[PDB]
Specification:
The structure is cut from a larger assembly and holds three copies of chain A, one copy of chain C (77 residues), one copy of chain D (206 residues) and one copy of chain F (550 residues).
Chain C (H helix, E strand, L loop, with lengths): L9 H16 L14 H11 L5 E5 L5 E5 L7
Antiparallel strand pairs in C: 1-2
Chain D lengths: L1 H21 L6 H4 L3 H7 L13 E4 L7 E5 L5 E2 L1 H14 L3 E6 L2 E2 L1 H9 L5 E6 H4 L11 E4 L2 H11 L8 E2 L4 H6 L6 E8 L3 E9 L1
Parallel strand pairs in D: 2-4, 3-5, 4-6, 8-10
Antiparallel strand pairs in D: 1-2, 7-9, 9-10
Chain F lengths: L8 H8 L5 H11 L5 H12 L4 H23 L5 H15 L9 H9 L6 H9 L1 H5 L3 H10 L1 H23 L15 H5 L2 H10 L3 H18 L3 H16 L2 H4 L4 H14 L4 H12 L7 H10 L2 H21 L7 H14 L1 H6 L10 H26 L16 H7 L3 H17 L2 H7 L14 H10 L10 H11 L8 H14 L5 H10 L8 H18 L2
Helix pairs in contact in F: 5-6, 7-9, 9-10, 10-13, 12-14, 13-14, 14-16, 16-17, 17-20, 18-20, 19-20, 19-24, 24-26, 26-28, 28-30, 29-30
The chains are: A mainly beta (48), C alpha+beta (77), D alpha/beta (206), F mainly alpha (550).
Chain lengths: 48, 144, 77, 206, 96, 550
């Protein structure tokens, strides 16, 4: 009930019934939670 | 980009979530095109760099061209572009993946299509979705 | 210059298929040549793959304005 | 304690220099790097400097016409006579921006005097206790940048919104007080994101 | 945080209103996200971060904390019919 | 090479030609002309033994050791004594000046002179004279030369100034009519990132005399060309120096403290009372015998963006004083604005003849012109309040559209009253009240110095006409703009022709083709004007063609 009307509106902005922008892009990336999956960043841990 | 990820991830943990698996897609390209890594390949490194740049242009989250819009476009796909550049550096492409030019072009097209399919559809009620998906794990929680 | 995405959302797919199937059920003309089909749902899917449905989507932008899209203009996925 | 008093005063001055440097005011590098023994060398404090002597005046890099005082009170609770002295000195020097520390609290009548005389003399009370640490250097606080009106209108035109629709930041929260932004200002906040790298948001002051 | 030899970068709390008083709203957002991530990952269960980010942003959208209970939620500038749906309905319809 | 007794190619030729012993002479040459270290001599026959030429070894160590010379002069730049530094640098300078003619040893001399604030005059003379050397020398040499050679300094600023005037003319005549963007839109920092001002600041460094040369060039250009744009560059140069924080020039230029306020106002395009008081103090700080800076101040105030700032401040002051019921004579801040604008507008008079006395104001401007503006404004607001009051009977009285002509007399007799009236016209055009607009549109046809027909007000009117984009539906309004006002000076002044032509470019679709063709034939170039008006005419014909298809 608190988070009822929050919706990804065209231009891909997260907004409520009040039309106040909550997130400029959904999940900070505009990507749904379905297709995303685990990958590894190969350049983080190795030495110079 | 390595220094940037050191700033972003001081925990030094590589497991992240991203719209597409690039390693398995490289594997699929290898097996579709029957690439034998025991041979000297034919892939031009500058073609790899140019294709990566063009694909980076093709993947857009924030539309419009202005300083704020381009800055937001950079920020949105920052981590995914860093991951793509690290994985698809010409070094590893010509060293271990050994992918062919036609297979590489197919890989670029496939990554483009799958990224464009991964965009959050407008009209989605992410509010109720987050609410239910966060309420469900509460049903199974030991009380310490 | 329609700024919204050129893709058809799954919700737009659901609504356009349902509405066109109901139209076909109401003895509407079929803008594709059927092949012995009887269910309006299959005929609507055939038209969608043909990109031959006369509906125009009107996406209301949050600022009160809107964009208009032909179904054939959008990318069916 | 005298030793901890000078340690506290040195960290107070360091946090003030970092603050007004973050506000765009002209801060030299040495005072940004001033050490405890260096703080002693430029001047033991208790029954030896003064909260009136420790006061500083800083200029704005953008506008040399604008200067900001940072005052410290010699009394526990700032009294209306001290506010009168500070604002009269501001009148003599033709300044309107002044920051005033408080040792542990402020007289409520002085709070009323602050809010009443705000447009002619912009004053901000500030706890010594909250000033002891530069809160901006914490890991949880993201990077804040005050936006100016051309940026505000270009952003609003880029997204076709109003000020009502943006997320808010309460003006009484300590980060807005650190930046000294007023109602109607909007702050761009850059933060790291574990799914997009960087994320930019915009908080309207209220 | 004011005490000597106390790292004023990594020091933190599990309380929320403290962070609102001393740190700031975005710090409260981040600390809330970290606490929910900790209590969800305690049993080994994983949840996508975007849902947590959405909830933390909705709670911190007003520049001040908004509990999901009726005290926090009913203050929100929504339509009265949302208040019909929530609870304590007639108490809000009288003001409407 | 032979300056230091080193055998060059000519020595090789005279030892080769007329010599029946090439083998012996070449062997002795290769042995004697080796590198003077004993350890190499054991390895040079072995180095060559594989067919590997010693050439590649020579080239690699040539690059390495010359780079190390560059690194070591960079290191000694700020090492130890300045005396030891300049002694060793002058030694290497005189040594390699023999080899400055060489293409590979010239950068050594370049770096050495780059690390020298002052050099012997003969080396500077050879650098200047030989065109290849001057084109291949760094600006560190050129600053000293210009400190003793103002002619080449003028020669260098001249093309940059030409490009600056070209871009100024293009920007003032940039064919795009919109309220948002115009010639006055860019911020001062945006205009100070021009390559001309950055290059000039580098070419001056931190020397007062080069700054004085730039000053005198700007005086000559602004006076002889009668073009205010150079003055803007002067202010920009000063602020660029202020951006560089050179106390050698910030602390000597007394107008630096003035341009604090000028920058803080021109960015706002408004003079607040605080900066007004500051400007008053700076004017009052000018003592006797040093009044030349007033001329500089007037020059600095001749910047057209500053005229925009002062005129809009006067107009907005007069707009807000009606609510407080205060006359222009009862406005000391406004009187100070009038003083500063009067001192600014007479700038070219102060450079043409060294006038260090203030220009005088007009009583009737205080008592007739500005109260006539207020008269129009408050009649308009009284009509508006009557409209917002109900119960208006049939055939209501129109707003009085009669024009008091002493107002127009002051427009066409006082450049001060003229320009402030022009900015008032632009401001009411932003208010877009047709009644007062067509009330005052007569009388603007005759104005002082053709300022109503100059680049500034015409460009701003074209910018503001986008708000009136749909107001062209009435042919009466279009005739009032075109047949009434614009086309008076179009045949006789080139800029008015260009401005009316670009107005037709933007507003071609929102008029009937009859009126569009009428204004096209009225804006035919006179047979002797510039290429711009004819190209605009061709674009007019193209647009008239395209409209028939829509």
């Amino acid at each position: 009930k608190s988070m009822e009307s929050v919706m990804v509106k065209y231009d891909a902005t997260v907004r409520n019934s009040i039309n106040q922008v909550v997130q400029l892009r959904y999940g900070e990336d505009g990507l749904a939670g379905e297709s995303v999956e685990f990958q590894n960043l190969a350049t983080l841990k190795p030495s110079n | 980009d390595r220094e940037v990820l050191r700033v972003i991830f001081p925990t030094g943990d590589s497991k992240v979530v991203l719209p597409c698996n690039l390693l398995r897609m490289i594997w699929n390209a290898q097996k579709i095109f029957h690439i034998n890594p025991r041979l000297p390949s034919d892939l031009h490194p500058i073609k790899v760099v140019e294709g990566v740049k063009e694909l980076s242009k093709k993947l857009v989250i924030v539309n419009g061209d202005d300083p704020l819009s381009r800055q937001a476009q950079e920020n949105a796909t920052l981590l995914f572009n860093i991951h793509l550049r690290s994985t698809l550096c010409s070094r590893r492409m010509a060293e271990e993946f050994r992918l062919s030019g036609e297979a590489f072009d197919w890989l670029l097209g496939e990554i483009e299509s799958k990224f464009n399919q991964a965009i959050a559809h407008p009209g989605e009620m992410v509010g109720a979705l987050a609410a239910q998906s966060l309420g469900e794990p509460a049903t199974q929680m030991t009380l310490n | 210059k329609r700024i919204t995405t050129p893709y058809m959302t799954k919700y737009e797919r659901a609504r356009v298929l349902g509405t066109r199937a109901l139209q076909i059920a109401m003895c509407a003309p079929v803008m594709v040549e059927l092949e012995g089909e009887t269910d309006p749902l299959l005929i609507a899917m055939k038209e969608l793959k043909a990109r031959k449905i006369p509906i125009i989507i009107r996406r209301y932008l949050p600022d009160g304005s809107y964009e208009d899209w032909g179904v054939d203009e959008l990318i069916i996925s | 304690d005298d030793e901890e008093e000078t340690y506290r005063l040195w960290k107070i001055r360091k946090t003030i220099m970092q603050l007004c440097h973050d506000r765009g005011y002209l801060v030299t590098q040495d005072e940004l790097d001033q050490t405890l023994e260096e703080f002693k060398a430029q001047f033991k404090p208790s029954e030896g400097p003064r909260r009136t002597d420790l006061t500083v005046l800083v200029a704005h890099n953008d506008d040399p016409t604008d200067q900001m005082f940072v005052f410290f009170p010699e009394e526990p609770k700032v009294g209306i006579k001290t506010i009168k002295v500070y604002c009269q000195r501001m009148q003599e020097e033709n300044i309107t921006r002044a920051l005033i520390v408080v040792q542990q609290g402020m007289t409520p009548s002085a709070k009323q005097s602050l809010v009443d005389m705000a447009p002619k003399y912009i004053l901000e009370q500030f706890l010594q206790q909250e000033l002891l640490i530069n809160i901006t250097e914490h890991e949880l606080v993201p990077e804040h940048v005050v936006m100016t009106k051309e940026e505000v209108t270009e952003l609003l035109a880029r997204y076709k919104l109003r000020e009502n629709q943006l997320p808010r930041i309460q003006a009484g929260d300590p980060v807005a007080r650190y930046f000294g932004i007023k109602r109607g200002q909007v702050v761009k906040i850059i933060r790291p994101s574990e799914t997009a790298g960087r994320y930019i948001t915009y908080r309207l002051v209220q | 945080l004011s005490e000597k030899d106390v790292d004023p970068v990594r020091t933190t709390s599990n309380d929320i209103v403290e962070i609102f008083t001393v740190l700031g709203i975005e710090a409260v957002r981040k600390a809330l996200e970290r606490e929910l991530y900790h209590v969800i990952s305690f049993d080994g269960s994983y949840v996508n971060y975007r849902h947590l980010a959405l909830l933390c942003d909705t709670m911190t959208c007003r520049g001040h904390l908004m509990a999901i209970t009726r005290h926090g939620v009913n203050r929100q500038d929504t339509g009265p019919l949302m208040k019909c749906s929530f609870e304590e309905t007639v108490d809000v319809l009288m003001e409407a | 090479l032979q300056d230091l007794g080193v055998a060059n190619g000519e020595d090789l030729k005279e030892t080769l030609t007329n010599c029946t012993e090439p083998l012996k002479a070449i062997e002795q040459f290769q042995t004697e002309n080796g590198v003077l270290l004993p350890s190499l001599q054991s390895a040079l026959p072995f180095l060559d033994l594989h067919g590997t030429p010693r050439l590649e070894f020579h080239q690699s160590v040539f690059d390495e050791l010359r780079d190390k010379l560059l690194e070591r002069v960079s290191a000694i730049a700020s090492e130890g004594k300045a005396e030891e530094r300049y002694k060793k640098l002058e030694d290497l300078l005189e040594k390699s000046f023999s080899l400055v003619k060489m293409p590979s040893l010239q950068p050594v001399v370049m770096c050495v002179m780059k690390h020298l604030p002052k050099v012997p005059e003969k080396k500077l003379k050879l650098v200047m004279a030989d065109k290849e050397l001057y084109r291949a020398c760094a600006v560190e040499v050129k600053r000293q030369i210009w400190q003793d050679n103002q002619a080449l300094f003028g020669d260098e600023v001249s093309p940059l100034l030409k490009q600056y005037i070209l871009e100024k003319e293009s920007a003032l005549f940039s064919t795009e009519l919109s309220v948002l963007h115009n010639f006055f839109s860019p911020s001062p920092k945006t205009r100070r990132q021009g390559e001309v001002v950055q290059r000039l600041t580098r070419m001056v460094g931190k020397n007062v005399k080069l700054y004085d040369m730039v000053l005198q060039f700007l005086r000559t250009l602004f006076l002889r060309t009668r073009n205010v744009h150079y003055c803007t560059l002067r202010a920009e140069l000063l602020m660029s120096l202020h951006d560089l924080d050179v106390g050698e020039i910030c602390t000597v230029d007394p107008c630096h403290k003035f341009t604090w306020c000028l920058d803080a106002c021109i960015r706002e395009r408004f003079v607040d009372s605080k900066r007004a008081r500051e400007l008053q103090g700076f004017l009052d700080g000018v003592k006797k015998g040093q009044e030349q800076v007033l001329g500089d101040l007037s020059m600095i105030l001749c910047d057209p963006f500053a005229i925009n700032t002062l005129a809009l401040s006067t107009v907005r002051h007069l707009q807000e004083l009606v609510g407080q019921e205060t006359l222009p004579r009862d406005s000391p801040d406004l009187l100070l604005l009038l003083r500063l604008l009067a001192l600014g507008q007479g700038a070219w008079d102060m450079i043409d003849s060294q006038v260090f006395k203030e220009p005088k104001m007009e009583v009737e401007l205080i008592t007739r012109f500005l109260p006539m503006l207020m008269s129009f404004l408050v009649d308009d607001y009284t009509f508006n309040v009557d409209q917002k009051l109900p119960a208006e009977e049939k055939a209501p009285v129109s707003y009085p559209n009669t024009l008091p002509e002493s107002f127009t007399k002051f427009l066409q007799e006082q450049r001060m009253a003229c320009e402030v009236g022009l900015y008032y016209v632009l401001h009411i055009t932003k208010q877009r009240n047709k009644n007062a607009l067509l009330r005052l549109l007569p009388g603007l046809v005759e104005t002082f110095g053709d300022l109503a027909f100059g680049d500034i007000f015409l460009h701003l009117l074209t910018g503001n006409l986008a708000l009136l984009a749909d107001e062209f539906a009435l042919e009466d309004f279009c005739s009032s703009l075109f047949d009434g006002f614009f086309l008076t000076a179009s045949p006789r002044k080139e800029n008015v022709h260009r401005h009316a032509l670009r107005l037709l470019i933007h507003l071609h679709p929102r008029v009937a083709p009859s009126k569009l063709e009428a204004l096209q034939k009225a804006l035919e170039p006179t047979g002797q004007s510039g290429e711009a008006v004819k190209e605009l005419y061709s674009q007019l014909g193209e647009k008239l063609e395209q409209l028939d298809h829509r």
